[PDB]
Amino acid sequence: VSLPEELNRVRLSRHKLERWCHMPFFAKTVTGCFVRIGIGKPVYRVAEITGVVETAKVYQLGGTRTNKGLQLRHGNDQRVFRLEFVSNQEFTESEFMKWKEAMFSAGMQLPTLDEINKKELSIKEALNYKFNDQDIEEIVKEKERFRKAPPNYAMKKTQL
Amino acid sequence: QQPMIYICGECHTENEIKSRDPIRCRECGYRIMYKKRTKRLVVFDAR
């Protein structure tokens, strides 16, 4: 792997992550792709997704709202992040070279082209996943856990 | 690419319901939801 066009395929933009805020198999379908997390001035640093963590701070991202961060790592430096700082821009040439240098310095073997090719299909097959099982209940529960009740047309129901 | 969008009953939020899927809202969880206005040329003659 040495091209940015082939690496941007698994780039999880900010618009796609809004449809898997509460979908199961999150750690299995997300762990593997790369994101252009913003550090901050316009420089960016691509990091690897090691797992998933829940932060104690709740924040609203446009319409929805979640409290799940993203344990990332850029070669050696690792820390907690959030899904609101991720940008929708693709991996530029400078950022690609920076990520390659960081990987070569850390020693982590670069992913394989076939690995990326077989992993990018995961998001595709998960997007068109039929909600036939009993996951809607868990989704609505996790949503209402943070979404306050009074809002808005259910005030009478809540009072009753 | 039309996943058929619906509007919840009490929440008035948009939802994407495909075929062979339950009719429920993404949140709260109701069993009522209406459709959205068509995209055709709804033209009237103020007569």
Binding site: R14, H15, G38, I39, F85, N88, Q89 | -
Partner: peptide, 17 residues
């Protein structure tokens, strides 16, 4: 309807906070 970005909606940074 995959990602209607059209750029974006002002992405916040980490160090800015």
């Amino acid at each position: 309807t995959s990602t209607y970005g059209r750029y974006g909606s002002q992405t916040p940074m980490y160090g800015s906070g």
